[PDB]
A = this chain, B = another copy of it.
Amino acid sequence: RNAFYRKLQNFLYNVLERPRGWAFIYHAYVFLLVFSCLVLSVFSTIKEYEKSSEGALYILEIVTIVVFGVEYFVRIWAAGCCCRYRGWRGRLKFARKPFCVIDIMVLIASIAVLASALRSLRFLQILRMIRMDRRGGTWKLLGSVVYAHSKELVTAWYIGFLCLILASFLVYLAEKGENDHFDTYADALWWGLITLTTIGYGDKYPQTWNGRLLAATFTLIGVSFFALPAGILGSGFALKVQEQHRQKHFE
């Protein structure tokens, strides 16, 4: 009777803590519960779609609080699997983890909201999505790659920033009188920031020949300097994962 006990204890510990394969099926369905509750709470703030949305948001919040309740409780129970945490003192030593106090605070708080209501419920679902990491693996991966490429990212930002100020000043000089778009300097800076990221809202565009002649040169230079750091970090991620594949095929 203890055999199937400990066998399922390590099975649930490996599905609830670091998973490998079809355990991501369970982590995807819990992410779909918190994502569907987030979208439905967005549909609840509109005045005309409020009745249908909250009519389903009540049962979906009860379902999410139950599913998170049993997943927390059997994370504590399946923490008795591992060779370090075992026993009453070991399980309560797992209660000493600050992430477990965070998760139990959120869970009792969702009971308290279900005992500006929907805005607090929306804050609690956002914090459950931040809770989904439990290890900062996304933050640590981004921090390692950003720190590895710090000289090129600073170079891309610094040269793009100086091109932004030069382009905005030259266009403002060209189009101060003949255009109500470019009334002050700050309007030229907002035009340059929206153009050089290739957003292009269209509320401000140069309408003289001087502004179009100057912006034609500076757009070709500047949008490259602003599209750089996505390319630098993109190839940094791909090179890092390629060498990890080779350093896995050895060991």
Contact = CB atoms under 8 A, between A and B. Distances in A.
A37 to B, nearest CB: 14
Interface in A156-204: 158-159, 162, 165, 184-186, 189-190, 193-195, 197-203
A70 interface: no
Interface stretch (A2-10, A41-49, A83-91, A101-109): A41-49
21 contacts: A42-B185, A42-B189, A49-B209, A141-B152, A142-B155, A149-B237, A152-B237, A152-B241, A190-B216, A197-B219, A199-B219, A202-B202, A223-B230, A231-B233, A231-B234, A231-B235, A234-B234, A234-B235, A236-B238, A236-B241, A239-B239
7 smallest CB-CB distances across A and B, nearest first, come from A231-B234, A235-B238, A227-B230, A199-B200, A202-B202, A138-B155, A152-B237
Interface of A: 42-43, 45-46, 49, 126, 129-130, 137-139, 141-142, 148-149, 151-152, 154-155, 158-159, 162, 165, 184-186, 189-190, 193-195, 197-203, 205, 209, 212, 216, 219-220, 223-224, 227-239, 241-242, 245
